[PDB]
Design an enzyme around this catalytic site. Structure first.
Site, short mmCIF file in Angstrom:
data_model
loop_
_atom_site.label_atom_id
_atom_site.label_comp_id
_atom_site.label_asym_id
_atom_site.label_seq_id
_atom_site.Cartn_x
_atom_site.Cartn_y
_atom_site.Cartn_z
N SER A 1 0.87 -1.19 0.00
CA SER A 1 0.00 0.00 0.00
C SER A 1 0.90 1.23 0.00
O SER A 1 1.79 1.32 -0.87
CB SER A 1 -0.97 -0.11 1.17
OG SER A 1 -1.43 1.16 1.62
N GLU B 1 -8.32 -5.47 -5.07
CA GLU B 1 -7.81 -4.37 -4.25
C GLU B 1 -8.90 -3.39 -3.84
O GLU B 1 -8.74 -2.70 -2.82
CB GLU B 1 -6.71 -3.64 -5.03
CG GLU B 1 -5.56 -4.53 -5.50
CD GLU B 1 -4.48 -4.75 -4.44
OE1 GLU B 1 -4.75 -4.51 -3.24
OE2 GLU B 1 -3.36 -5.16 -4.81
N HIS C 1 -7.17 -6.01 -0.40
CA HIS C 1 -6.03 -5.12 -0.18
C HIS C 1 -5.45 -5.35 1.21
O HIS C 1 -6.14 -5.16 2.22
CB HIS C 1 -6.52 -3.69 -0.36
CG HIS C 1 -5.44 -2.65 -0.39
ND1 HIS C 1 -4.47 -2.59 -1.38
CD2 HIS C 1 -5.21 -1.58 0.41
CE1 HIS C 1 -3.68 -1.56 -1.15
NE2 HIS C 1 -4.12 -0.92 -0.08
C1 LIG Z 1 -16.68 6.92 7.68
O1 LIG Z 1 -16.19 7.33 6.43
C2 LIG Z 1 -14.87 7.18 6.58
C3 LIG Z 1 -14.21 6.01 6.17
C4 LIG Z 1 -12.85 6.02 6.40
C5 LIG Z 1 -11.98 4.99 6.11
N1 LIG Z 1 -11.55 4.56 7.43
C6 LIG Z 1 -10.69 3.72 7.81
O2 LIG Z 1 -10.52 3.54 8.99
C7 LIG Z 1 -9.95 2.94 6.83
C8 LIG Z 1 -10.22 1.51 7.24
C9 LIG Z 1 -9.41 1.16 8.46
C10 LIG Z 1 -8.96 -0.23 8.43
C11 LIG Z 1 -7.84 -0.02 7.55
N2 LIG Z 1 -7.12 -1.15 7.61
C12 LIG Z 1 -7.01 -1.85 6.58
C13 LIG Z 1 -5.83 -1.77 5.94
C14 LIG Z 1 -5.67 -2.56 4.79
N3 LIG Z 1 -6.65 -3.37 4.44
C15 LIG Z 1 -7.79 -3.47 5.06
C16 LIG Z 1 -8.77 -4.33 4.62
C17 LIG Z 1 -9.99 -4.44 5.25
CL1 LIG Z 1 -11.19 -5.49 4.66
C18 LIG Z 1 -10.22 -3.69 6.38
C19 LIG Z 1 -9.23 -2.82 6.83
C20 LIG Z 1 -8.03 -2.70 6.18
C21 LIG Z 1 -4.43 -2.53 4.03
C22 LIG Z 1 -3.67 -1.31 4.29
C23 LIG Z 1 -3.98 -0.19 3.65
C24 LIG Z 1 -4.77 0.75 4.33
C25 LIG Z 1 -5.11 1.90 3.67
C26 LIG Z 1 -5.16 0.57 5.73
C27 LIG Z 1 -4.76 -0.84 6.30
C28 LIG Z 1 -3.32 -1.24 5.69
C29 LIG Z 1 -12.25 7.12 6.99
C30 LIG Z 1 -12.89 8.24 7.39
C31 LIG Z 1 -14.20 8.25 7.17
O3 LIG Z 1 -14.84 9.36 7.56
#
Ligand SMILES: COc1cc(CNC(=O)CCCCCNc2c3c(nc4cc(Cl)ccc24)C[C@H]2C=C(C)C[C@@H]3C2)ccc1O
Ligand SMILES: COc1cc(CNC(=O)CCCCCNc2c3c(nc4cc(Cl)ccc24)C[C@H]2C=C(C)C[C@@H]3C2)ccc1O
Ligand SMILES: *[C@@H]1O[C@H](CO)[C@@H](O)[C@H](O)[C@H]1NC(C)=O
Ligand SMILES: *[C@@H]1O[C@H](CO)[C@@H](O)[C@H](O)[C@H]1NC(C)=O
Ligand SMILES: *[C@@H]1O[C@H](CO)[C@@H](O)[C@H](O)[C@H]1NC(C)=O
Ligand SMILES: [Cl-]
Ligand SMILES: [Cl-]
EC number: 3.1.1.7
Lengths: 532, 532
Positions: free
Chosen positions: B197, B324, B437
């Site tokens: 990533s 992804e 991803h």
């Molecule tokens: C509510 O609307 C929103 C939505 C978001 C997006 N919020 C987040 O917290 C991103 C998701 C957090 C988990 C991130 N961790 C993950 C990660 C990865 N893959 C994931 C796959 C799944 Cl299925 C679930 C979580 C993954 C792979 C990597 C890449 C990223 C960007 C974050 C982390 C490492 C942010 C602000 C908002 O206001």
């Protein structure tokens, strides 16, 4: 008696013709206007002045002045489309085939030949009406109309060369049928107009034009529709092409009157010899002198008329062939040959795309290329060949016709859509060309019923099926016979969009005739070209 | 002794950790920079001042300050990515796993975590270096770097908040490895940096940046590349977002110094709470504070550096996962759910396209929609869902990486490309999300070797299959062992463009990874957007 008919313009004497193992009556070369010669060249036509005595209607008339194909001299596959009679500006005649004995008031079918508005003849062997008239018990008319500059030179604002006079030619023929076909046993209230290529575009243009709508009952369109990109030009582009014609012939260009006067002094062949020089671009499937959107024959743009329902509301039957593009690529694009499989290099593919979409900017050309290129296999000469074939057929015939079909069906009273995909067993053109533009006509006119032409038994059956579909539609507005045990050709509807294949196999019903590329051709690409 | 190491900054005492049925040495939480706290917030990192006595490296360090996901509280599938240690701005530490007994000078692999430049921790269970270090006999380092505004707030022209300081943190850790890994049995001349990533994009950015190139030998990029649309902004856009951050927090905006002084007074969580508010569009797969194209870390635009070959010439190994996009749609787009098949309506499809390509005009959105819609079956909720999944993945990960691969391979010294498409048997996310991803990482780090985690025996073999590829590439520049006759992973070349699938089935070689869609994303759409 049977062959002696008094019309509103005078007496005509037909001839008795053999058809299969029987006979029918033919009235050939009946005049339906004044010869458009001399000071009447480019002019709106005038009705034929009544004659005394008996018009001998035993022989085909002259063909209209037109470009004559010499690419393959003596080759039957191309010569079958060339004039088979003497060419003359005195060419405004119609032919009638009448069942024997004469019926009382039977269904009438009026054939309008195609040829890109630059060519065509009512007298071709493939348009011989006797098989359809005899087999289906219809009165079959074939009309004629001026082509090329003679029919479509357009200097808007002039009453001497207003444009669209070839369309007006067709109209007078339809009015003659309206006035006189009852004397031949035909019902003027049950007239179906049908045509292929520019004839199909023409049929659609009469559906649109208020001055034409009351002169027929219903309509068949084969491989052509009024909105096709090759089928009309603006008044400005028509004016530009008329002036460029005069420039090619050293004419005074200072006024319409002087330009027209110069052009009227030329021999017909002098105009024909420079006809293709007035096109704006190197192109295929583009023709110099075509209908103009004038504000008279067409009150407003074709698209606004289609959107608003400003057209004749009736039944239509229409369709396309599988490989509409191949003829145009053979004659005009690099890498294609009548004597080879015509595998197309990537370079020749890109050249062909440019010839096929001549009006597109570079971004538009990129869009067409991406839509029709397999980038896992971009040097495959067969995929490149067939991709270009599809580009030409989709852009010029199929997608315009599907746009027309979808707009028409919102207001019309019954649509039947076909996809003709049978390659004839005795075709003289190579296999890469597939199911060629024009090659459903011989099935419509019943040529497979002639044993000497060496069609298969299945092809005779297919021809009989198609003739019965066409004639039953003409009679009833529905190609299907009721209470019949044969599979039914379903209505095309806005929701389900059904169509049938026409071939020697049992009927298949499909939906959304090619829908993907026509979203491309009818919605995405025009928006791209309009943005850029 | 084995656990007591004198580095150039002072002594460190590691700890002996169990790994499978053996043991290795771990040095956890070694400082490589001065804590970037107080007046040092947003500033370039400064080297850690040497300490007297023995640094206790038995325990994981704090994690950097970051947004913490609370969408699915207590759900292991998302919680596994959240900080598992206390968050602090005092977070610039690295971890080292060393085989026991200590090797002489073995290959070094340096892990750079991802998280969109807004999140990430070196201490996650899924980045535990012990299985890879033990199984492949490498010295495994994981570094850390500031994320969010703390790492990437960019007011170009200011030396107090210049931008890219998170990238400079990574570089400082690589400099520490260069200077000190020899004391841990690592060869500083054979360092491979690898990341996923934003860590994969970061690896590519160190390949580009002159100031980073001499601090490693070769590189692995997983599901990220430097030219990804989410991975950098212009100096003007970084400045806009920094000012908007201040606006959100009632800061003085008259000058960089006053804005920075204000932002440095805020508690870390105050910045994090408004971080997403500075994005210019409603969007998915877009992050607020990311690298800036500054003319210093990046001498010119990424595209011109890639075109001119202005980058480190070495071997690279890189690839992508099958799906992804699914994670980003689950978290940000209408119609998706963790607890359903997430069949997507047409309306929600169109909303998703807009979120996925936030920078596109309406013609651009039409182009994307046409490219990914089956118009024979446009109300199919599975096709709509998977089409959106592919749009997000193709636009944000696969096609940018293929552009990078293509450009790099012209000048580089060896490219190996993979497509990871194995769905883990024990995955806690639903089947519609596919190969997610981030979910190749657990195979790279050897978690299937842990019996209690309940991978299949085929998944253990695949993990061993991947660790050996990665570590053999790190050692030699070639993932294949010579004179072995397992199937060979071919070099990716400009002409043949070969890649392999990575899954539990025997290796298959393919060519032109998602070539059709990446012509759209890499050539046609950028041209369309530029021209309109
Ligand atoms: C509510 O609307 C929103 C939505 C978001 C997006 N919020 C987040 O917290 C991103 C998701 C957090 C988990 C991130 N961790 C993950 C990660 C990865 N893959 C994931 C796959 C799944 Cl299925 C679930 C979580 C993954 C792979 C990597 C890449 C990223 C960007 C974050 C982390 C490492 C942010 C602000 C908002 O206001
Ligand atoms: C590149 O040079 C030129 C190339 C061309 C190309 N086009 C022409 O010459 C017109 C050629 C007419 C060919 C005969 N008419 C055909 C016709 C049809 N189909 C044909 C299928 C094949 Cl395979 C061959 C000929 C067909 C179906 C109908 C439609 C048209 C336009 C003409 C006529 C009727 C014209 C002028 C040029 O200077
Ligand atoms: C290092 O820290 C660990 C965990 O806090 C502790 O158990 C150990 O005793 C420490 N070592 C020292 C203080 O030498
Ligand atoms: C890498 O460089 C070496 C020596 O310069 C050369 O022999 C080899 O062919 C190169 N390999 C690739 C894949 O470019
Ligand atoms: C793994 O399998 C073991 C034994 O089959 C079981 O006790 C345990 O619950 C499983 N772990 C998870 C996380 O499901
Ligand atoms: Cl899936
Ligand atoms: Cl190469």
């Amino acid at each position: 008696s049977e062959l002696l008919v008094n019309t509103k313009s005078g007496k005509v004497m037909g001839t008795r013709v053999p058809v299969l193992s029987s006979h029918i009556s033919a009235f050939l070369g009946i005049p339906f206007a004044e010869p458009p010669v001399g000071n009447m060249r480019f002019r709106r036509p005038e009705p034929k002045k009544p004659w005394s005595g008996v018009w001998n209607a035993s022989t085909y008339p002259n063909n209209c002045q037109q470009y004559v194909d010499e690419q393959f001299p003596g080759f039957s596959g191309s010569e079958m489309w060339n004039p088979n009679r003497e060419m003359s500006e005195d060419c405004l005649y119609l032919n009638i085939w009448v069942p024997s004995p004469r019926p009382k008031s039977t269904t009438v079918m009026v054939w309008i030949y195609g040829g890109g508005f630059y060519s065509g003849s009512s007298t071709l062997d493939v348009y011989n009406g006797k098989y359809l008239a005899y087999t289906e018990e219809v009165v079959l008319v074939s009309l004629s109309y001026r082509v090329g500059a003679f029919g479509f030179l357009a200097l808007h604002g002039s009453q001497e060369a207003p444009g669209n006079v070839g369309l007006l030619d067709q109209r007078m023929a339809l009015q003659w049928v309206h006035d006189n076909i009852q004397f031949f046993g035909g019902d003027p209230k049950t007239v179906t107009i049908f045509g292929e290529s520019a004839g199909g575009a023409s049929v659609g243009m009469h559906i649109l034009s208020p001055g034409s709508r009351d002169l027929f009952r219903r309509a068949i369109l084969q491989s052509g529709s009024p909105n096709c990109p090759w089928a009309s030009v603006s008044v400005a582009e028509g004016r530009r092409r008329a002036v460029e014609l005069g420039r090619n012939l050293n004419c005074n260009l200072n006024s319409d009157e002087e330009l027209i006067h110069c052009l009227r002094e030329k021999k017909p062949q002098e105009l024909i010899d420079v006809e293709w020089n007035v096109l704006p671009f190197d192109s295929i499937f583009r023709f110099s002198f075509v209908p103009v959107i004038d504000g008279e024959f067409f009150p407003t743009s074709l698209e606004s008329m289609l959107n608003s329902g400003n057209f004749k509301k009736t039944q239509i039957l229409l369709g396309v062939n599988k490989d509409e593009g191949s003829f145009f690529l053979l004659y005009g694009a690099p890498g294609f040959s009548k004597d080879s499989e015509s595998k197309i290099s990537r370079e020749d593919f890109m050249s062909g795309v440019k010839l096929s979409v001549p009006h597109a900017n570079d971004l538009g050309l990129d869009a067409v290329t991406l839509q029709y290129t397999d980038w896992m296999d971009d040097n495959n000469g067969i995929k490149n060949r067939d991709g270009l074939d599809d580009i030409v057929g989709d852009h010029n015939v199929i997608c315009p016709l599907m746009h027309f079909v979808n707009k028409y069906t919102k207001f019309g009273n019954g649509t039947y859509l076909y996809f003709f995909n049978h390659r004839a067993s005795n075709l003289v053109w190579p296999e890469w060309m597939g199911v060629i533009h024009g090659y459903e006509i011989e099935f419509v006119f019943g040529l497979p019923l002639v044993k000497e032409l060496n069609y298969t038994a299945e092809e005779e059956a297919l021809s009989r099926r198609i003739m019965h579909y066409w004639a039953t539609f003409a009679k009833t507005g529905n190609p299907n016979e009721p209470h019949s045990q044969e599979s039914k050709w379903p209505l095309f509807t806005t929701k389900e969009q059904k169509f049938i294949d026409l071939n020697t196999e049992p009927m298949k019903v499909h939906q959304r005739l090619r829908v993907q590329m026509c979203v491309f051709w009818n919605q995405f690409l025009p928006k791209l070209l309009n943005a850029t």
